Write a protein that binds this ligand. Sequence first.
Ligand SMILES: Nc1ncnc2c1ncn2[C@@H]1O[C@H](COP(=O)(O)OP(=O)(O)OP(=O)(O)O)[C@@H](O)[C@H]1O
Ligand SMILES: Nc1ncnc2c1ncn2[C@@H]1O[C@H](COP(=O)(O)OP(=O)(O)OP(=O)(O)O)[C@@H](O)[C@H]1O
Ligand SMILES: Nc1ncnc2c1ncn2[C@@H]1O[C@H](COP(=O)(O)OP(=O)(O)OP(=O)(O)O)[C@@H](O)[C@H]1O
Ligand SMILES: Nc1ncnc2c1ncn2[C@@H]1O[C@H](COP(=O)(O)OP(=O)(O)OP(=O)(O)O)[C@@H](O)[C@H]1O
Ligand SMILES: [Mg+2]
Ligand SMILES: [Mg+2]
Ligand SMILES: [Mg+2]
Ligand SMILES: [Mg+2]
Lengths: 261, 260
Amino acid sequence: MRILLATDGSPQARGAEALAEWLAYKLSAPLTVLFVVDTRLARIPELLPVPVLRTELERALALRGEAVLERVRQSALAAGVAVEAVLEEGVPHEAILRRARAADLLVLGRSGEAHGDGFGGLGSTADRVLRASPVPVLLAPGEPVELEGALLGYDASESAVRALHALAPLARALGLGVRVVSVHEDPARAEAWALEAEAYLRDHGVEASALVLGGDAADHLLRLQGPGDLLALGAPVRRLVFGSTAERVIRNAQGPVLTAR
Amino acid sequence: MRILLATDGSPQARGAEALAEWLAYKLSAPLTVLFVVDTRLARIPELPVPVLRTELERALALRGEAVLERVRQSALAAGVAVEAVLEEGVPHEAILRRARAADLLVLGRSGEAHGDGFGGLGSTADRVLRASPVPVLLAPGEPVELEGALLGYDASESAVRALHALAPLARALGLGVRVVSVHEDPARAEAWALEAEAYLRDHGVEASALVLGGDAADHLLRLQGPGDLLALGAPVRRLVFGSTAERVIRNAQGPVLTAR
Ligand SMILES: Nc1ncnc2c1ncn2[C@@H]1O[C@H](COP(=O)(O)OP(=O)(O)OP(=O)(O)O)[C@@H](O)[C@H]1O
Ligand SMILES: Nc1ncnc2c1ncn2[C@@H]1O[C@H](COP(=O)(O)OP(=O)(O)OP(=O)(O)O)[C@@H](O)[C@H]1O
Ligand SMILES: Nc1ncnc2c1ncn2[C@@H]1O[C@H](COP(=O)(O)OP(=O)(O)OP(=O)(O)O)[C@@H](O)[C@H]1O
Ligand SMILES: Nc1ncnc2c1ncn2[C@@H]1O[C@H](COP(=O)(O)OP(=O)(O)OP(=O)(O)O)[C@@H](O)[C@H]1O
Ligand SMILES: [Mg+2]
Ligand SMILES: [Mg+2]
Ligand SMILES: [Mg+2]
Ligand SMILES: [Mg+2]
């Protein structure tokens, strides 16, 4: 099981770096650390000796990238993790998505270099990656935190099924029980969803419990997540004005989130 | 890994039944066998009527019970942990619902409606592979052990899913994988091939590559032996002349593993 950590070396990415290393160690899984030299920054001179200016900027960005990679590589080696570092140039989300094809789990921070420590939202690189990634994406808040619990938003939709299947191995390897949350006005429908997810988890060596609720799903999922709880759910598709369930959950999440498509 | 075998008890489903049991045994994986009482058949009388429908459902349900008992007996004999499930509704619908709790589906290419000379795909198999959330393995009627594996890889999203789905299977079976990447640009195809080979090796699977040009479907079809598991992404659109996967799946000579 290959873990791919994407980091821009920013404070907001520190939690992701720590979590990826912690997971690699706990799961005895190899870790690939990726830093992308942002062409959107290097191209600024062009949007305005432009080739020279662009080269000078790329050189600075690449050197910063090498420093970040070396720092994480050093940390990972110290932890006893089999780590490899990759430095590429391009649009961050595109490069990350390309490298994701060879990974089994991605770990990114909620935000990065562009936002201060007061930002509770999601950066655009993280947003674009989770919406198009072929493999599960784990978004970690800036402040490092261990995964001490797990909950799953399950409505039996295709993506919820993928989230369910993606979560099982992680919960199993970490010894975490999973709280299945199924929300619907029809209690019989929600119950059927919950029992299904619980059966799957138990069949895969994971303890599970369920909460069959009515009302607003996003609100319930957000309120039930503790700072160390991994909240797993299907990734959003449409970009709704008021936001779909997953959009509202991911934007306001207090703890680590695992998305799957 | 939970394997879900869907069978209608027909001769065309015998291959899938055998393969599912064989895989469960080889991987020490639990097996669920599902038979669906087809409401499309039971409801024919609706075209009193309720009594006639009930009499047909009763017959269909009893056949299903017999099929499940036969398969369960075989599996239990091999030491496989098997669960039997009797459902009623539209086959592909019930199969797709049950798939949400499985990690791999095993179905025959065709079933009860076609003779032993049909090399095509039945509508239940078609609908299931196109909408399944988990990998679907389509097995020919004649039972055959998987003795090899090939992967059609063009780095597309579904090809990536197929690649990730195949790895655990090839590993457990000790089969090497021949990666086939096709494109007019040799460099692009090689990059694709190398990417898949690297993933497979990183997951304990030996791999080789065939970088080709020309028609992808033709190459994939021609390279598949009767015992080779051909893994590829499931089709999306229903093209008039058929997309690559549509053509491969329709004419495949051996077992196919689809993912999406
Ligand atoms: N250049 C990069 N290289 C590698 N990973 C990156 C890069 N940029 C962002 N990431 C990953 O995406 C996560 C979110 O960063 P993101 O760029 O989306 O937020 P932001 O930088 O604060 O706002 P924005 O980039 O939209 O202006 C980071 O914590 C990191 O894991
Ligand atoms: N009622 C619910 N109960 C529990 N979890 C839910 C519920 N609704 C949504 N979710 C979670 O959120 C994920 C995505 O739901 P969401 O409706 O936001 O995406 P979508 O429906 O697939 O795309 P779209 O917003 O375009 O319809 C689901 O896969 C599931 O994990
Ligand atoms: N009633 C059923 N219950 C369980 N599995 C089924 C059922 N019907 C079909 N299947 C699965 O689907 C595979 C393909 O059968 P399919 O129904 O698609 O071909 P067919 O019956 O010959 O043609 P058609 O059903 O379109 O008239 C079967 O081998 C079996 O694995
Ligand atoms: N050039 C190729 N080389 C190797 N394998 C291929 C190639 N093209 C397609 N495939 C295989 O066939 C699968 C599906 O390809 P296909 O083009 O038929 O589906 P699609 O492109 O995703 O949907 P659509 O036909 O609507 O565009 C891929 O995931 C891949 O495994
Ligand atoms: Mg950024
Ligand atoms: Mg929805
Ligand atoms: Mg049929
Ligand atoms: Mg295609």
